[model samples]
Target: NPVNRLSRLINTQFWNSLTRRVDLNNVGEIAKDTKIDTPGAKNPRIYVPYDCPEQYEFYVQASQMHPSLKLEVEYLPKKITAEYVKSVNDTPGLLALAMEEHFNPSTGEKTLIGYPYAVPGGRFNELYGWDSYMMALGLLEANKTDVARGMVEHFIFEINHYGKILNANRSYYLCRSQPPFLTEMALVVFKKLGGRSNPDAVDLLKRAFQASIKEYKTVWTASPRLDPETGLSRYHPNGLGIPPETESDHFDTVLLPYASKHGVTLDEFKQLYNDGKIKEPKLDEFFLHDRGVRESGHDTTYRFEGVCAYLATIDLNSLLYKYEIDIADFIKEFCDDKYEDPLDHSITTSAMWKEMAKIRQEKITKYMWDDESGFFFDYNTKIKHRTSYESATTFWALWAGLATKEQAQKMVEKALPKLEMLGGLAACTERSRGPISRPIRQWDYPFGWAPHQILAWEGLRSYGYLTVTNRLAYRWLFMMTKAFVDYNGIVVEKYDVTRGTTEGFGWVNASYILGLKYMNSHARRALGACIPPISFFSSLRPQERNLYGL
Candidate 1:
């Protein structure tokens, strides 16, 4: 929809990096650990040699003619230091690296985030959606309360400024928002800070709760995102700028290489893209839709296929159930006591929040539940039944207390065994998809990611399913720690659940964990914020008063 020279340049570099051959070599020379200033509005401002420079001046000059495009200079670093980019290591001592903070406090960012925060391993390199939530749990588990609070602060800032946290505070992520977990983040932060009625804590809690509802109503529940008949919210784009040239995905670009064999040159594809030909066969088939599904934090699962924009997602609706519960619980605890009479809505809004939670839970249970299959699936709102996919996101129902004892029991009996692996639970079961039906999805089995583990564990633990949570924690920790020891202590983004190592033939992500046992009921309740025995989701702030029960 818009064009700019510097933006073009920035995008050109991104395409180069996304070719799946990214590193310090072709990108730039890596001077391991050499710290320097990052210049430009873009993240990952690695210094690289441009194919051309002066020739673009006319393009820049032309950009001033319109608001859509602009001319700008980029800071090209001669050397991409190895220090800025981490390399794979086999050193046994590096095992603890995965446990360390991934905070990058300062960046020349438009949406300013002053607090330090941890990131998931490898190239993610920034605070991410579900990743930050899981990492926040780890931080709280390890007593890194200050850093965790800062991370939550950044999340609130992102929601306040961007309206919803962009896929993780990068310019490219403006189109999509991740699964709603800011409410959970505020709960943990509130508990860690003191569970007190202090104005600052109260204000932060109120701000976060308000921001969560604002986003829930404005972003997820509005317009094309919400299903009217089912009353369920699906993952959809923010309806921002159209996909730009030089911005393509692995799935989207795959069509090009095949198309080129049919004589569709890169220039031709670029021309087609520039001319508003987005839905061209195979070119943008998965582009717009894939971006939305990525927001669910399970990008390539067979669950939605490409119907992400329409399907009533189990994961999202379940998490939103948590959001409803969170807001209700927060107001219930402090609005009357801590909030001044004029400011307090707990007097009137408490039941409203409870109703919100009730409605969402009822919808999820009615639509997402699959009695025949004994699991929950993303409802194909258009067709009006559960889709053809039964995924690991069913665990979220338990986490949000959206499941019945009967439903939870079915999952434990039939769903859990099929999904369990040596390391942790597979994202989906072996029965979830057919061999030719889907390719290797990082979010699908036999792979298990860090965030899912935390969610599933906490979800089961919430229902007092200690045996399963403990089993998962022990097996997952053994897998992660053993991989760290067997290899050279390097932590990756995901794990091959079946193989249980980053070095396995397949596997790519990681969420981070301090003590695996943090997923257990006993370990979490022991934290003692202001509440009673609480799991990871509880506002256990140590005001020593457990107010609301999940």
Candidate 2:
């Protein structure tokens, strides 16, 4: 009964609550998705590219009708530079009147328009890049096909209008993106929607396939994101100054010591530093890694402390490898093993896509794999060595089909023991994550996210580790179901997997639903049998925690 209720709550209640659509009528809802730690909410501003005349006109006309909305509509210059972002933030109403032939890098300023999509719960109230992919997996599991399709369409919209699938739709995340899952999500939708039998689904798949190739070529393979030496992609975002998408006080731990060193208060130091009045090389370096970690979607982890920017992460490469493999599969299945490339206007073949994946897999094995440790690790490009961080990302190699059969066998034996917890797989081993007495990173040890568990389970399953996969699925599903019954159907984000308590992060309803789908009927029955009786709990409603931890 609890399992039935939990599924219903996520499919109906949480899914509806987390969905957001951008428009004049929903300006108030869109405005609430800000990360500015200020007393009063500023009027929401929507930015449209100057080249996108239709979007610009739509917003202009929409704002005219709803004069009471106080929505500020602005045109983005064809070329968005750091200078424009600085000027706009300094002068709120400043409009970019000039037009360039082509657009360059993005800088944070205003919300970008996108299709209706689901947000990760709480503070992440906008359409995000990789989270949408993960959520799409769960949405498919729950049979919410239209919702999943809309999210993929929104990602296509982002790539077409905003240049890439952004970290999120917010202006602050314009230049950064999460892990590469565009093609994978597209393929999942394509297969889920009857594949070739459904003409409409095929058309959507074609569009997503084109968009994903554009993203693969332009974003992941281009300068800054691609490491030349290893030929592997890294998370390199294009922004300056502090990241503006966090709560005002979220960075106190990082900035307080620097403020004391500068003999000024934290606020004063931030102002001086942002204004370019203070030159702290260390702080500048720290922000570079900070931005990279956020782009990686792990955020604040000791595994990446002070070195995330220079590391060729195993997770990113594996995802990109998956993208290449998916593209090849699409070419064979949908296009007779050949297709005309839209981005470069070249005739692309399935063999070519396969070769691309082969090259990436080779690079990943060469740089990221640690033969001695029998696991994949993040290769520090600057130091020319792989760091000994035991992250769940090692399983991503299996998920992407990059690991050799021998390597996959070794991984389950060597790495899984260190990361697996009573509830599920932790983000990293406790020893690798350092002492908990130190500054806590929500992405680090003891905290297990649904995405990690879901991916890890799939990865293990792909390698024919049925028993291990069932065990993991049971642990994670049991933990989530117990929490759902105990917390009154509330699913926050991350969980302390070691203890089965909510630790707080993104909305994981979709992930939980998908995790159950991975379980066999026997495992599902076992999970249901193990769940505690709901009447054993107290009747009093528990205190709820919001994104702000209030």
Candidate 3:
């Protein structure tokens, strides 16, 4: 009864401001109305009747006397008709127009700058990175080159202003950065806006290439040791914050052999430790003699020995590989004049690219692919075994151009169908069997997210898995559209890919919006009409429609 009273007070404009100050002179009358008894001299032993007709009627009367009101907040309805949907068949284009109107240069300067979503706000940078990347896609689809370029420049400005983009405008987000797709986005921008031989544009590309490389070396590097034996990078325990009890343990195991063979003495390895202790070795080391003593006093002591072994993840490695490719390209184009015999230099660059690709492919086959599971897993170099976690990172192999046609086909057949559900695409399929397997809780499984969708879709398209690519694209677009419609055109950071449900979080809205733009561009391409090509898609390898038995 008090809750109802409070709700009413909250819903009423004046009552909300006056409730605390309300006089209690008519306490007995109010109590009687609400079926709550007030202490009185005549009725010292007050008893509030429950499940009594008279009490129920009194409570109802009290509730209505100060009726709880529902505020007229506008939200888009979840369901719509075919006719209504058709009215905006070009909804993506319309949404882009709305975003442009709300986020133009003038609007940005006047409203966005210094606002919670922009400079002082770390979220501004995060959302901006995501928003601009997606908006650029829309601009590319609509052939708005200057606008798209401007969007890219805005993010670059944020990066330059803030050492790294913040998660939000808050002080807490100062240290975080989402997936570093900035370089990938920048390259796309240049491709669309810059002339074929523009020196300034070429210079910008060089800088972007450098930035990508820096990010890889600084943020995503697996470990300090560059193993000469495996010719692959190593990772340390606690390098990534995954708990040892989870699937991360398996990653530590597989990478152990390379770790042991790397020839770092126990003392030397101790020196390389985190937080003044030797890091946990790979998983296989746990099964070794005297493993418990070896793991004593380490950060992962309580966990299985060698379970904390770390290695480069498939996604990180793939991004690094792409960075390498981009860098090699930038060097060939921009630094050719500095190097004598440009052709010879180009040949050398090509060889390096080939080598890098070959090595990456080998690593994928050697470490990532799981023959038993028919999916990819994170490699633990210490134990020289694969972890059984199936995450979006598995799909990154395709995005990184690391998968062969056959592998991609197998992934689609074996992984996608089984994993794909109502939300979009889950973060991991294993979540279905986990405690957090409910619809809203399925972020890591049976629920899709924007970033993963983009990566997987692009990877599919890159490898000429056109039909699969198209199918994924359609699903993603539908999910986004439904969400946008439900949220009254407000884009979200991420959605349950399987159920199309959105819960908390806000940074991924930009990605969802941009994904829509990408879909629109693809639609035009499919219709055999030319739209102003946004640079983001310019470098996209033509889909090999016939390559994947589509």
Give TM per candidate: 0.68, 0.86, 0.52
Best by lDDT: 2
| Candidate 2 regions with alpha-carbon error over 4 angstroms | 37-41, 90-114, 122-124, 252-269, 277-279, 333-343, 501-507, 520-522, 531-550
Q: What is the descending lDDT order? A: 2, 1, 3
User: Which candidate model has the greater lDDT, 1 or 3?
Assistant: 1
Number of clashes in every candidate structure? 18, 1, 46
TM-score of candidate 1 against the unseen true structure: 0.68
lDDT of 1 by residue, 160-240 (tens): 545577565433454568887888888888877776756677777887776676777677778668878888887867432
lDDT of 2 by residue, 370-410 (tens): 76666898898888888879998889998888899989888
Q: Where is model 1 poorest over a 10-residue stretch in terms of lDDT?
A: 89-98
In candidate 3, what residue range of length 10 has the lowest lDDT sum? 92-101
What candidate 3 gets wrong by more than 4 Å, as runs, is: 1-178, 197-199, 217-311, 337-350, 431-433, 437-442, 486-490, 500-550
